[PDB]
Amino acid sequence: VLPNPGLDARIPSLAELETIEQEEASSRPKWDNKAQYMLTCLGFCVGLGNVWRFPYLCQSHGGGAFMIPFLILLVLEGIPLLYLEFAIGQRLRRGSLGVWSSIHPALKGLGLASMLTSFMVGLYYNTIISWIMWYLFNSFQEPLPWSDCPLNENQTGYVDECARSSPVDYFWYRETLNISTSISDSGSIQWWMLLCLACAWSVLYMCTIRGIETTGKAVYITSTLPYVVLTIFLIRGLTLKGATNGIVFLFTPNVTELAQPDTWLDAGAQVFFSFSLAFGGLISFSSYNSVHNNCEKDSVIVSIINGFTSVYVAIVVYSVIGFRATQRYDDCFSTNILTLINGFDLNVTQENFVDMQQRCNAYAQLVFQTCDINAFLSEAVEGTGLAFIVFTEAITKMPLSPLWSVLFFIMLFCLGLSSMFGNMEGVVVPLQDLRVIPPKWPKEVLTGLICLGTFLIGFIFTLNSGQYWLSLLDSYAGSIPLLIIAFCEMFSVVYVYGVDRFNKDIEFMIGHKPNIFWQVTWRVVSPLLMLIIFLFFFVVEVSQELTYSIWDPGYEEFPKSQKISYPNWVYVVVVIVAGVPSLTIPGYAIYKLIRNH
Amino acid sequence: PPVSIWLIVFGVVMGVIVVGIVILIFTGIRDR
Numbered sequence: 183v184l185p186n187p188g189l190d191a192r193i194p195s196l197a198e199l200e201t202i203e204q205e206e207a208s209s210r211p212k213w214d215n216k217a218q219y220m221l222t223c224l225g226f227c228v229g230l231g232n233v234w235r236f237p238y239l240c241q242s243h244g245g246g247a248f249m250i251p252f253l254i255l256l257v258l259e260g261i262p263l264l265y266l267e268f269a270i271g272q273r274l275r276r277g278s279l280g281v282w283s284s285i286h287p288a289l290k291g292l293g294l295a296s297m298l299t300s301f302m303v304g305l306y307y308n309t310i311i312s313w314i315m316w317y318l319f320n321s322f323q324e325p326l327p328w329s330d331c332p333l334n335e336n337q338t339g340y341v342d343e344c345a346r347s348s349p350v351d352y353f354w355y356r357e358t359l360n361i362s363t364s365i366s367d368s369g370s371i372q373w374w375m376l377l378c379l380a381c382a383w384s385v386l387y388m389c390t391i392r393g394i395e396t397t398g399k400a401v402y403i404t405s406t407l408p409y410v411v412l413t414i415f416l417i418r419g420l421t422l423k424g425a426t427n428g429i430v431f432l433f434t435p436n437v438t439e440l441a442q443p444d445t446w447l448d449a450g451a452q453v454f455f456s457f458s459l460a461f462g463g464l465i466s467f468s469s470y471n472s473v474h475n476n477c478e479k480d481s482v483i484v485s486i487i488n489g490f491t492s493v494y495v496a497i498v499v500y501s502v503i504g505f506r507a508t509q510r511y512d513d514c515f516s517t518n519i520l521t522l523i524n525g526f527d528l529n530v531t532q533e534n535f536v537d538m539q540q541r542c543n544a545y546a547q548l549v550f551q552t553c554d555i556n557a558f559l560s561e562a563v564e565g566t567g568l569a570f571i572v573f574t575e576a577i578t579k580m581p582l583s584p585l586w587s588v589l590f591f592i593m594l595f596c597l598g599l600s601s602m603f604g605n606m607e608g609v610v611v612p613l614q615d616l617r618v619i620p621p622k623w624p625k626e627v628l629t630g631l632i633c634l635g636t637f638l639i640g641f642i643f644t645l646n647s648g649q650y651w652l653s654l655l656d657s658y659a660g661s662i663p664l665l666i667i668a669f670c671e672m673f674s675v676v677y678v679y680g681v682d683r684f685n686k687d688i689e690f691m692i693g694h695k696p697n698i699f700w701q702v703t704w705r706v707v708s709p710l711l712m713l714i715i716f717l718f719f720f721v722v723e724v725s726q727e728l729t730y731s732i733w734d735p736g737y738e739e740f741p742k743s744q745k746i747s748y749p750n751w752v753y754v755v756v757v758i759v760a761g762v763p764s765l766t767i768p769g770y771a772i773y774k775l776i777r778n779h
Numbered sequence: 780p781p782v783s784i785w786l787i788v789f790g791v792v793m794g795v796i797v798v799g800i801v802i803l804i805f806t807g808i809r810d811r
């Protein structure tokens with residue numbers, strides 16, 4: 183609809199599209215099998231991002247409260263954009279940076295924002311992988327290293343922190359992070375974290391050495407194993423005590439959470455992380471299919487699987503949350519029963535406690551804790567605590583602690599590695615298509631330079647303050663660009679390339695022209711939701727002081743986390759991470775409209 | 780424990796990955 187001149191002779195014709203298919207036999211990489219393509223999409227849209235952030239968002243906000251908006255926007259906003267990313271990659275036979283420049287030469291900023299975004303999300307994920315594999319390396323010892331504390335000089339007590347806090351808290355914050363007091367306080371690099379980070383980058387380079395002719399072989403173990411281990415954690419989790427108390431907690435939501443602006447803003451951002459939309463990997467992966475592949479069927483299958491896996495993962499995370507909560511409630515009670523049993527020298531079990539405590543009425547001297555179970559269930563976990571302080575502590579209670587621990591980290595490592603394949607796809611290919619390195623050099627040279635590059639950038643997440651540094655990318659900072667790109671990708675394929683031409687091309691490939699559902703979303707519904715969502719982001723999340731949780735042993739109520747405001751200079755870092763890729767789309771356009779004229 | 784058990788797991792994994800890395804590069808240098 184916008185005045186696009188001479189779009190053809192920049193894009194391939196449908197006639198050439200049917201022929202060039204053979205021309206791309208060696209000119210471009212091609213999926214050996216559809217299986218191999220479907221497994222890749224499965225991992226990129228159902229790996230970390232769908233299985234890591236989701237249960238954290240569900241634990242925060244409300245359990246079932248947050249799940250309703252997510253499944254509304256998953257289809258009203260995610261299915262459309264996923265079907266639009268797959269079809270446009272399959273038609274223009276080029277990666278993200280190629281697909282946007284082709285539609286209009288001033289839209290090349292849209293493929294550099296996607297490359298930067300992909301880079302940053304990989305840098306974030308890689309760290310998570312490094313922590314996962316630190317934990318996976320320590321889980322080959324009968325008594326797992328986070329099931330006890332180091333002894334003190336008296337040997338009668340454990341390290342004060344470990345004593346006041348939890349063994350799992352001490353293994354996370356002290357033995358793994360050696361975490362500092364503040365983001366401002368930044369110590370030297372913790373050599374063992376650096377060593378695990380090296381291992382992470384090394385394994386990823388090995389699996390992505392030679393583009394998709396090495397990752398397609400990898401996704402046979404990397405997109406299956408994670409789903410054959412998460413159904414065992416569902417059986418185990420469901421067979422845990424008090425587990426069904428947590429599942430009900432998840433399905434008994436407070437409707438007043440659904441009527442909060444912040445819940446919706448988190449669900450939308452989350453849709454574009456669940457499906458790796460606006461990372462640009464998917465466009466590239468769909469561009470190696472047959473020109474006559476049914477991408478509508480693929481988008482719907484991926485979305486169903488991606489939607490259904492989100493709920494299956496919150497049912498495994500809540501079985502464990504209610505298991506721990508039940509244990510804590512039983513302890514509180516038991517400890518309360520002990521306070522009075524010893525004090526009044528006396529049969530105080532479950533029902534008797536309430537009736538007998540009334541008879542005992544040293545009651546004043548006796549100090550009694552309040553056991554609620556619902557309070558135990560409604561106790562939020564510090565970021566990344568669900569995996570390193572909630573799931574780890576629950577496994578230490580399982581009969582074969584080492585077996586489970588190992589399996590739990592191998593699942594998180596595999597669905598991380600899977601996710602990283604797409605994240606790396608979306609930074610290698612744009613960098614090939616800029617023709618930045620001399621094209622005589624092999625593909626392996628360019629893939630190692632970015633592995634080392636991102637490896638060197640990842641030293642900041644290896645300091646004492648590194649965890650604080652990593653929790654900045656969990657702010658609106660890492661979400662603002664995704665919304666801008668996703669909206670621009672939809673607007674460009676509908677009001678620039680033309681939805682009429684797009685529909686005709688879809689008809690040429692799959693056979694039929696897309697349904698009214700696809701028409702009503704692409705044209706109005708989908709774009710509007712994105713407009714309303716990111717505007718709400720700017721009015722709510724951005725319009726809020728950025729605060730983080732610090733772990734200070736020397737703090738009143740030490741065991742309780744302390745929330746403090748970031749020092750002003752970290753707005754520079756946020757301003758940059760958000761604008762760098764969000765102002766690229768406008769600011770390369772303006773460059774192309776002042777050089778041409 | 781005389782040697783930290785993670786280091787001897789880390790070592791096995793890192794050794795296997797670097798062996799994989801050199802095999803894949805030579806494989807690619809011999810397929811061109």
Ligand SMILES: *[C@@H]1O[C@H](CO)[C@@H](O[C@@H]2O[C@H](CO)[C@@H](O)[C@H](O)[C@H]2NC(C)=O)[C@H](O)[C@H]1NC(C)=O
Nearest residue numbers: 243244247435436437438439440441442445560
């Ligand atoms: C369900 O969602 C509502 C709305 O977010 C929660 O209401 C909050 O409750 C706390 C504790 O009483 C108050 O400090 C907040 O100010 C409330 N927020 C609002 C906007 O009313 C509610 O707590 C959630 N679930 C529960 C456990 O009731």
Ligand SMILES: CN(C)C(=O)CNC(=O)/C=C/c1ccc(C(F)(F)F)cc1
Nearest residue numbers: 233234235238498565566567568569656
């Ligand atoms: C801070 N942040 C933004 C996060 O996203 C943290 N995510 C987590 O801490 C995620 C835990 C997690 C644990 C178990 C499973 C299982 F179900 F697979 F077992 C999944 C996810």
Ligand SMILES: *[C@@H]1O[C@H](CO)[C@@H](O)[C@H](O)[C@H]1NC(C)=O
Nearest residue numbers: 356357359360362369370646
């Ligand atoms: C942890 O960091 C401190 C500096 O903050 C350093 O002195 C110490 O050797 C480090 N080692 C530990 C305790 O992991």
